[PDB]
């Protein structure tokens, strides 16, 4: 197979991989394409998401024209390091991995016209600024921006191979999302102005929507049951101070525990999430369910219970058996309709 060996020797002979194609002659145009093999999990604490893609780059290098038996040279990824390749980096990438098990996951195909296809398998951790103000009923547009690190807009321009909506493809089976739903993605192009010049930036915004099922099970239901549990004491006779005292005290203790552990899923943001308001209102109900008993006990003249003169049923108790369940139900309708 020395015929193909001569071609590779001929191509790399007098080849300077330190200069982009058309240096000082034209703008090097790079056509890109992304295939998302798996959209990895989203981390709220680090405000980052993981993506696993086939990052395909296509461009024409006239220094790599050949005539041979085969029109396309499906070469080895070792050949890539001997050829000028674009220095694409991700602007919001935190810590990315270019996999090389068991070999560098790269392909390089040189058609006889000089076109190069250069795809790699990358795992990218990207910064996704999250406005956790409607948490957990919130949605984010996690971006993915990339462009040439060194070459300005006048030297290297990026472009989408197919139509922009069709040049980023998500595999149906690959979705490593636990508590999110990938609604879709919008593909766009922009411009950034740094201290070193203009740079074309290719962006892709993935539109995630958090699934509320987990937080309903683990946070909203315990808060709702605690409010209902605290209102059970409204049906107990006023001459049972120890029993109703334990009812109010334990529920307030329970609410404090829930109010603390509910933040463990989030970064320490300075505002209040939509879940914080629900906990605050539940805290207000449970706290007031004990102040209500602290008022009935204040008017409990006798200590012995019914089986002389006996205590009458509290008028505060009768109203609290209705107003407290009713207001909480009214609050639930307002709270859920506001965010859903």
């Amino acid at each position: 197979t020395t015929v193909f060996t001569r071609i590779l020797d001929r191509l790399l002979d007098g080849y300077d991989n330190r200069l982009r194609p058309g240096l000082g002659e034209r703008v090097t145009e790079v056509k890109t394409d992304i295939f998302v093999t798996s959209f990895g999990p989203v981390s709220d604490h680090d405000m980052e998401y993981t993506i696993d893609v086939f990052f395909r780059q296509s461009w024409k290098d006239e220094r790599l024209k050949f005539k041979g038996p085969m029109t396309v040279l499906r070469l080895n990824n070792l050949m890539a390091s001997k050829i000028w390749t674009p220095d694409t980096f991700f602007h919001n990438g935190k810590k990315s991995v270019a996999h090389n098990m068991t070999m560098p996951n790269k392909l390089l195909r040189i058609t006889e016209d000089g076109t190069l296809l250069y795809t790699m398998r990358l795992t990218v951790r990207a910064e996704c600024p999250m406005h956790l103000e409607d948490f957990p009923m919130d949605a984010h547009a996690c971006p993915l921006k990339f462009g040439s690190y060194a070459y300005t807009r006048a030297e290297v321009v990026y472009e989408w191979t197919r139509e922009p909506a069709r040049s980023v493809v998500v595999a149906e089976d690959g979705s490593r999302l636990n508590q999110y739903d990938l609604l879709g993605q919008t593909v766009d192009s922009g411009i950034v102005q740094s201290s070193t010049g203009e740079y074309v930036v290719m962006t892709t915004h993935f539109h995630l929507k958090r699934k509320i099922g987990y937080f309903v099970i683990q946070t909203y239901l315990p808060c709702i049951m605690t409010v209902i549990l605290s209102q059970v004491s409204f049906w107990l006779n006023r001459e049972s101070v120890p029993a109703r005292t334990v009812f109010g005290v334990t529920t307030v203790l329970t609410m404090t525990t829930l109010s603390i552990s509910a933040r463990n899923s989030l970064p320490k943001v300075a505002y209040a999430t939509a879940m914080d308001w629900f906990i605050a209102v539940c805290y207000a109900f449970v706290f007031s369910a004990l102040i209500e008993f602290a008022t009935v006990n204040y008017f409990t003249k006798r200590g012995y219970a019914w089986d002389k003169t006996f205590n009458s049923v509290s008028k505060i108790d009768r109203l609290s058996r209705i107003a407290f369940p009713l207001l909480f139900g009214i609050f639930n309708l307002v709270y859920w309709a506001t965010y859903l």
């Binding site: 798996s38 080895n76 991995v97 098990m101 068991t102 996951n105 398998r121």
Partner: peptide, 15 residues
């Protein structure tokens, strides 16, 4: 020359 075998569903791998 060795085959460019790779594992599609691997996250972190080493020899």
């Amino acid at each position: 020359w060795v085959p460019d075998t790779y594992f599609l569903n691997d996250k972190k791998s080493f020899v």
